[PDB]
């Protein structure tokens, strides 16, 4: 009812394309660390053989402020356009 429970900040997991996900994550880490920094949050990357999932643990702000900045970068145009 008001107290009495383990458990305060939250964790949420951010949703992105394989495609997005090396532009996200950086060379091998070099721009998502950036936000876990302006955010302040953890930042915890997918496996290698596994669906495309960023983990982001904190509170129930700052958490989804990260997130909005991850799916910023799938519409964010980094690199070349000519095939």
């Known amino acids: 009812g008001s107290s009495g429970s383990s458990g305060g900040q939250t964790t949420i997991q951010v949703r992105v394309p394989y495609r997005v996900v090396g532009l996200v994550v950086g060379p091998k ?8 920094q302006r955010t302040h949050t953890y ?13 982001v643990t904190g509170m129930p ?23």
């Open 29 to 36: 880490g070099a721009t998502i660390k950036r936000i876990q």
């Open 61 to 83: 702000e700052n958490v989804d402020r990260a997130r909005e900045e991850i799916e910023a970068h799938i519409t964010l145009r980094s690199g070349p356009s000519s095939g």
């Open 43 to 55: 930042i915890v990357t997918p496996g290698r053989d596994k669906e495309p999932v960023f983990a």
